[PDB]
Design a protein around this ligand. Structure first.
Ligand code: MG
Length: 87
């Protein structure tokens, strides 16, 4: 999903993929992988997005985490895990 928000921000600016990659100082293919979600949004990328597009690094990272946590939540055996008690 983070890639969707990035592309939506770019559409509003009328900025193309190549112009985005150029400003981000990344290769075109890396930019595409980021926008399509084929490449996770790392801390360095979060920092770059904050400067180049806007908002804070955490905002971008949280979009990533929200998507990752949403996916992993149903794959974890939370049903059998228990809260630790004071020993
Ligand atoms: Mg690159």
């Amino acid at each position: 999903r983070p890639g969707d928000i990035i592309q939506e921000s770019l559409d509003e600016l009328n900025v193309s993929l190549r112009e985005f990659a150029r400003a981000m100082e990344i290769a075109p293919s890396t930019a595409s992988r980021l926008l399509t979600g084929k490449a996770a949004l790392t801390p360095e990328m979060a920092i770059k997005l904050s400067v180049v597009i806007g908002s804070s690094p955490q905002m971008w990272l949280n979009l990533q985490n929200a998507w990752s946590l949403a996916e992993a939540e149903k794959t974890v055996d939370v049903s059998r895990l228990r809260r630790l008690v004071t020993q």
